Design a binder for this molecule. Sequence first.
Ligand SMILES: Oc1ccnc(C(F)(F)F)n1
Ligand SMILES: Oc1ccnc(C(F)(F)F)n1
Length: 147
Amino acid sequence: KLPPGWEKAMSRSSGRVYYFNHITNASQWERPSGEPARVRCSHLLVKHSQSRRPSSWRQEKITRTKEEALELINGYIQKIKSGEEDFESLASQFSDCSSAKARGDLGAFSRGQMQKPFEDASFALRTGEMSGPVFTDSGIHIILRTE
Ligand SMILES: Oc1ccnc(C(F)(F)F)n1
Ligand SMILES: Oc1ccnc(C(F)(F)F)n1
């Protein structure tokens, strides 16, 4: 019926059907369209107090809760989707990864190198598509597949 990992859902506030991907945590209104050795992705990372290394170039001691980190991620997703902000802009300013200085770009990679929830989301995204919140031991990610 639908590309890898998609299911039909119903909006609780509008009653209109939408589509949800349980691998990328993406959601959209329109019916989804539809694997390579490698993909290229950028990401925006928000760390929290239970991240493996609760430290980043932005903060020596990262104290925010996981719930607070998810709220920030959700807010960034809203502004990217509204066009109020660009993914690259928010990654450069607010990502708790070193890759912030490269607008979030991680380069190209194969399966085997990344943490599994990050890797599955990266490979299930289509070129150009953005993930919803993706959870790993590092933190919560927004992932943008660029190639
Ligand atoms: O692969 C590498 C090596 C060093 N730095 C980066 C990044 F993310 F900052 F651009 N990527
Ligand atoms: O192994 C590691 C270390 C840091 N970040 C990641 C990932 F995939 F979540 F981006 N994996």
